[PDB]
Amino acid sequence: SPIYDINYY
């Protein structure tokens, strides 16, 4: 749900 989480990956 959190597309921003991908940046953290």
XYZ file of N, CA and C in Angstrom:
27
model
N 0.855 -1.220 0.000
C 0.000 0.000 0.000
C 0.882 1.259 0.000
N 1.978 1.243 0.719
C 2.899 2.404 0.800
C 3.945 2.405 -0.320
N 3.664 3.075 -1.403
C 4.639 3.122 -2.529
C 5.930 3.793 -2.057
N 5.834 4.675 -1.101
C 7.054 5.369 -0.597
C 7.993 4.340 0.043
N 7.449 3.291 0.595
C 8.308 2.254 1.235
C 9.354 1.764 0.233
N 8.999 1.678 -1.019
C 9.975 1.202 -2.039
C 11.244 2.055 -1.976
N 11.103 3.345 -1.834
C 12.308 4.219 -1.770
C 13.217 3.751 -0.631
N 12.648 3.402 0.490
C 13.480 2.934 1.634
C 14.216 1.653 1.235
N 13.553 0.773 0.535
C 14.209 -0.498 0.117
C 15.540 -0.184 -0.569
